[PDB]
């Protein structure tokens, strides 16, 4: 506040006063409706069956939690999950695999013999409180 | 600093229920019905799951602490002052805390009743990878003493296990005074130069 | 259940040599056994058209452990014991004995 | 020997190259020029499952056998001492202890009200 | 300071006539204020006091 | 959800599980801009409220059926200034500084906080007590004796 | 160093009672308490004076820069 | 009938300093890690650390700029005449003074009064080998006055009895452990360093910010040479699935693929590496893919490297400049020279098979950490650390200075051959000419380290800090002085960190590090003090007879078994993986070893041996039977329940051990050991505090700092001293109320206070909280008088 | 603002900003005449 | 090869009864410590699973049995030296390991735990 008048606060918050006609259950459902939901939060298991034939075949099976479980915990429908995977996730996955192929062919390995960067008042720091 | 024979009897009787508290809380966080034994193989496997997670250990520590601190509050409420041998105005230790001359009823209770649960950085006593809080205690021990709950008082003395745990909590405060980069010097200097 | 022993041989005869998981070989090549004279150390050596086999006994294991191999009978219930040394065998290829200049630039 | 996605020579033990990178019908080891394949190696598969710790969520936390979340209501302060409340006048008052400043400096007590829930900090 | 971490500066060198005198006829060498002990909780010094007296007698 | 991915013969070995894992925790199903999580705490002094871990007033304005849009508080001073004006930001400064002191049970007269807030809002903006805020000050000697 | 002249608390001469105290412990084989009583030390202040005396002077004297060996 | 004070006994000992064994052995046991450490520098098996150090620095080669003139392609390749210079032996003499002819003995008292250093003549047999020993020239060269440690192997006081010490102007029960440098008593401060020869799985965010696609996960082993010099090897798990080997030479870091360093050690197949890391757990898809990334990656990057020799040559070619090994040394020689000097040096030369087995174990531990099978090892915890003793540190920097000394001889010859050419190496005249043009005063260089604490080195050792290795042995009072030799610091580098975990008092420190004795403020939790019964390892013995005992107890040999992972127990002796067993049998061996250890019937098993057993757990520490016998180890005595005999325990093995405090607290089926006295967990000064179990925690801590700042007795031999400043209490008194350990350390030799009539009273009005009243008539009578 | 010489001599800008600066160390704050310093001791009779 | 020095070639090798009929044949492997004498023992007590007990001249032993690479080399002829065992590589039917076991004494609690 006083010293930096930061526009980028560490913990930005909003206090929302709820009405009387909105119940404790309705308010908790509303909390879920605004809270950010990630794909990670609805996935239980991912099974990748890498099989090489003819072409690298990658069978990615997304085992999510039960439909009624994540719909009651995140207020997310199956339709909402379909749109995100078919539009965002696959485009994001394809870009990540392409980037990993380029990174593999770019640098074949670290340079041998060439030095790399290191990993990581003296009496004053050893002075006790009475000193 | 002395309690009467009557007052000291109350102290031992309330602190006698504290032995069960350790396992009771351990059985509550772990979610096990009929209150399973302290040496139960399923319980010991369940407490290991808690040991490996910082959040799970936090739930265990906060539950056990609230339960043992409730036993502490009971001892203090019963024994002080209705159980003290010498009483106010003659009990100068009691008088100084009540007058506001020096000290409080909390310091008085650590002297005459018990030190209580030794809290370290909001939680209980630190535990090793083996599940032991000290080489003296059993791995995954479901006891209040093992967690840092000191039944001993400064008048009667404190056991070596309690002594080491008190040393931990005592030092913890001095460590915080050494690692505190926050200073009000520059904050005030910036205001005073613009408001002079 | 006490099992009786028929014969014990303290002389060299049969030997065991560990290679790696999934070792087949041509199964027509020979392995020459060697001995040194408290505890005797053994050396194994074989030869092939494309490969070469070399084996030896571990110095720390020989003086401390004594390995024996036996044949069991299902009716007589008697075992014929023979001392067998364990030889840590490695296989060298035709690609070996390849090297560049001792000093490069 | 063939193990999962890997293929090793039965003669020397050197890891054999992928059949896609080298020429068709036949494959050979870098160490010994051994005759391969036997055509029984097949189009191998490797079932790789997620880390289980990979997706930390509120639902995954609820799937754990032990208590992972504390009740909003069931929250008992850290202990209670019989101290006069400065807010109005109450008997039950919660507390907290720690040793601040020097080893010569006294013990600081952090009081907490029950009727209103007002924090405090007083040394003596 | 005592062997219990109770250090204090010399406020004054009080005369023996002005010093409190015991029934035995002894005036203390050092005077510690009772308001030091409720905050520090140095009970080791309290037991040291009655132990030292018992051992002197 | 099952889907097959076909790669070239030259792509060879790749750690797909680790690649998928990282993208899943990066993929957002639903997110309201600048807001991460909305929680329901215990009613503060009898007032039924919801505490958000983010700031976006215009988004909350659409939730009129649930929220009283004339009482929507925020700790972010700059965000309050941008949407509700200098006087609202001024009131946020006096309230927020008071929250810092009230937590440690320290009482500071509002006459002090109001003066500090008025000095920060003297230019109609949100100036801090530092070299930047000071730039708009008459005395060069005062400035020279600061830094 | 040496036995102090007079008790710090009251002022009763204690300096003449040091060598006499060791004689009551050695030759007479008496206990610490009874030996102090025979010297005429009844106040616990006068009692501790001799009882608690170290006598480092005997250790200090063994270093003499005026005599060889 | 009582726990009385010795009055008659005390005064008799004051007049009569014993002529036999000195009283208070615990006082000499306090300076045992200091004297012992310096003693091992010359005395002991293998001829001491200093003879081992010069044996490890080896030769230093330079070639003459002269042709062959042979009747040829050999002439062009001919480098000239070879000159290999080394040091065979290293000698240290007790302090002497020559006046040019006959030498005289100089004692510490003289050095203090003279305001000079207590130096001993340093000699070292130089080897001047020409054309690979066709003519050898030896010369014992005087290399200045090396400051000698008091009451040590090379001190005139070590034999002396209390009587003899007083006759030589020293304290009757003189401890030693310090160095007299320019009249100032200076000691080498003990340091907390990573436990030797143990792979440590660590999560560090520091590892990520160094390179591209670097994770938090990694392994760190602090390999130590027999000469006590250390060389740390780090393993990194990259997000690509690649594993890299990190090390340090000179003051630069270097990275090499682990599959390259593996194939350089011994001839192996790709499947031998597969069996070495992945055991019977072949179905583990996580491991199946990661290992394929390593093997295929090496084949892709280095397809040419098809044998052990080619790998060594490729390694030699890239490190020929940094390792300075040139110009006749082949890439195969330089390659092996890199391996022998960097990769897992604790197993040493002619142990490449042992280095290979240990490296595979580190890769499996690394993969167990990434997956989560293994919890990360805590470096800040007492279990995963040892104590670098002053004498060992002194030997390390000495080895560094003699390496520099040989480099300087070559530098002078290089100057000579690059100008006037001068003459040949076979002439003694030339050798004598070179040698007196080289600065051979190592004594002054070692005197500097003891006078500044500044570490000047070409490698920088395996330490982070560069200053404060030496501190003045402050003798303001004996309590402060004796605490110096029991004080241990984590490191100067750790003092400048926002992390509080380092300062935190942990249960791992029980009986090793004192919970009370730590300063207030800035050095809180950093400047620790050991427990009074805690001991530090000076060397190792019977270690070679233990594998024979293990193999007989059912340990299957690692060379034949070929199965690795957390699913099986790994048996190791000082970081040497000897075999494999089941976890069930793993505990059986660990319990039966301890039984034959305490029993004096077994000749090959020493009582000081550390048996670190780690049982299998769900996402806990990496399991195994990690045995230790080496130097610098933290050790403490406990009572072993069966047989009722003393047992020596380390901080690593204690973590899983059940040791009861009092015999009445022993619980059935869950206790194997009991403490002798709980006083064993506290320091000397912490034990000296009366009724400490009745005082509040920070007051007991403040008393240690108080007793250290008191105007007590700094000594009785003051008339032969010349110190900066000394504080002396005139009227010292023996405490009526005292711990019996006060007599065990003979603290009556140095009284720190006085017994006073104290009344807890508020009367004057001038006494309140931080102010106390002193009696005028008491002060007038000499109460609390000082000079 | 000057080239490196084989710590340089401070310029007049450096003289005005040595540490806290001439303004802070010798104008806003100053060492004074007719002043004393001593350890404080308690007294209930004054 | 020829190296190392002090090593002499094995010319004479004793006969091994190898047939592998079908009432079937079994090949066993046993691990033994250097302290025990094999020529002294003419009978070995062994039963199925890990459970086993043995006492040879004051020393106690245990015969660990495990179901589950090592390659067996059997001599076909004395002049043919050693060759790899095969039927259709060869594996052992039953694998055993002798481990020296010591009896740790029971803690005398009545003597050590004193009030
Ligand atoms: Zn091959
Ligand atoms: Zn109230
Ligand atoms: Zn007196």
Swiss-Prot record, chain B:
Domain of life according to the entry: Eukaryota
Annotated segments matching region Bridging helix: 160-172
Record-listed Phosphoserine modification sites: 57
Subcellular location, record wording: Nucleus, Nucleolus
Known function: DNA-dependent RNA polymerases catalyze the transcription of DNA into RNA using the four ribonucleoside triphosphates as substrates. Component of RNA polymerase I (Pol I) which synthesizes ribosomal RNA precursors. Besides, RNA polymerase I has intrinsic RNA cleavage activity. RPA190 and RPA135 both contribute to the polymerase catalytic activity and together form the Pol I active center. In addition, subunit RPA12 contributes a catalytic zinc ribbon that is required for RNA cleavage by Pol I.
Family in the record: Belongs to the RNA polymerase beta' chain family.
Miscellaneous field: Present with 2840 molecules/cell in log phase SD medium.
Oligomer status and interactors: Component of the RNA polymerase I (Pol I) complex consisting of 14 subunits: RPA135, RPA190, RPC40, RPA14, RPB5, RPO26, RPA43, RPB8, RPA12, RPB10, RPC19, RPC10, RPA49 and RPA34. The complex is composed of a horseshoe-shaped core containing ten subunits (RPA135, RPA190, RPB5, RPO26, RPB8, RPB10, RPC10, RPA12, RPC19 and RPC40) where RPA135 and RPA190 form the DNA-binding cleft. Outside of the core, RPA14 and RPA43 form the stalk that mediates interactions with transcription initiation factors and newly synthesized RNA.
Protein name: DNA-directed RNA polymerase I subunit RPA190
Shown stretch of the complete protein: 833 to 1028 of 1664
Swiss-Prot record, chain E:
Coiled-coil ranges (or none): none
Location(s), subcellular: Nucleus, Nucleolus
The protein's role, per its UniProt record: DNA-dependent RNA polymerases catalyze the transcription of DNA into RNA using the four ribonucleoside triphosphates as substrates. Component of RNA polymerase I (Pol I) which synthesizes ribosomal RNA precursors. Besides, RNA polymerase I has intrinsic RNA cleavage activity. RPA190 and RPA135 both contribute to the polymerase catalytic activity and together form the Pol I active center. In addition, subunit RPA12 contributes a catalytic zinc ribbon that is required for RNA cleavage by Pol I.
Assigned protein family: Belongs to the RNA polymerase beta chain family.
Note: Three distinct zinc-containing RNA polymerases are found in eukaryotic nuclei: polymerase I for the ribosomal RNA precursor, polymerase II for the mRNA precursor, and polymerase III for 5S and tRNA genes. Present with 14100 molecules/cell in log phase SD medium.
Protein name (Swiss-Prot/TrEMBL): DNA-directed RNA polymerase I subunit RPA135
Originating organism: Saccharomyces cerevisiae (strain ATCC 204508 / S288c) (Baker's yeast)
Source organism phylogeny: Eukaryota, Fungi, Dikarya, Ascomycota, Saccharomycotina
Gene: RPA135
Residue window of the full protein shown: 918 to 974 of 1203
Swiss-Prot record, chain I:
Coiled coil, from the record: none
Location relative to the cell: Nucleus, Nucleolus
Function, in words: DNA-dependent RNA polymerases catalyze the transcription of DNA into RNA using the four ribonucleoside triphosphates as substrates. Component of RNA polymerase I (Pol I) which synthesizes ribosomal RNA precursors. Besides, RNA polymerase I has intrinsic RNA cleavage activity. RPA190 and RPA135 both contribute to the polymerase catalytic activity and together form the Pol I active center. In addition, subunit RPA12 contributes a catalytic zinc ribbon that is required for RNA cleavage by Pol I.
Other information: Present with 2840 molecules/cell in log phase SD medium.
Family assignment from sequence similarity: Belongs to the RNA polymerase beta' chain family.
Description of how the protein assembles with itself and partners: Component of the RNA polymerase I (Pol I) complex consisting of 14 subunits: RPA135, RPA190, RPC40, RPA14, RPB5, RPO26, RPA43, RPB8, RPA12, RPB10, RPC19, RPC10, RPA49 and RPA34. The complex is composed of a horseshoe-shaped core containing ten subunits (RPA135, RPA190, RPB5, RPO26, RPB8, RPB10, RPC10, RPA12, RPC19 and RPC40) where RPA135 and RPA190 form the DNA-binding cleft. Outside of the core, RPA14 and RPA43 form the stalk that mediates interactions with transcription initiation factors and newly synthesized RNA.
This protein's name: DNA-directed RNA polymerase I subunit RPA190
Species annotation: Saccharomyces cerevisiae (strain ATCC 204508 / S288c)
UniProtKB/Swiss-Prot annotation, chain J:
UniProt entry tagged with the keyword Phosphoprotein: yes
Its job: DNA-dependent RNA polymerases catalyze the transcription of DNA into RNA using the four ribonucleoside triphosphates as substrates. Component of RNA polymerase I (Pol I) which synthesizes ribosomal RNA precursors. Besides, RNA polymerase I has intrinsic RNA cleavage activity. The heterodimer formed by RPA34 and RPA49 stimulates transcript elongation by Pol I.
Family the UniProt entry places it in: Belongs to the eukaryotic RPA34 RNA polymerase subunit family.
Miscellaneous comment in the UniProt entry for this protein: Present with 3360 molecules/cell in log phase SD medium.
Parent sequence residues shown: 23 to 156 of 233
Protein's recorded name: DNA-directed RNA polymerase I subunit RPA34
Residue numbers carrying Phosphoserine: 34
Main localization, broad class: nucleus
Taxonomic lineage from the root: Eukaryota, Fungi, Dikarya, Ascomycota, Saccharomycotina
Assembly information from the UniProt record: Component of the RNA polymerase I (Pol I) complex consisting of 14 subunits: RPA135, RPA190, RPC40, RPA14, RPB5, RPO26, RPA43, RPB8, RPA12, RPB10, RPC19, RPC10, RPA49 and RPA34. The complex is composed of a horseshoe-shaped core containing ten subunits (RPA135, RPA190, RPB5, RPO26, RPB8, RPB10, RPC10, RPA12, RPC19 and RPC40) where RPA135 and RPA190 form the DNA-binding cleft. Outside of the core, RPA14 and RPA43 form the stalk that mediates interactions with transcription initiation factors and newly synthesized RNA.
One GO MF term attached to the UniProt entry: DNA-directed RNA polymerase activity
Superkingdom in the source lineage: Eukaryota
Entry's localization field: Nucleus, Nucleolus
GO annotation, cellular component aspect: nucleolus; nucleus; RNA polymerase I complex
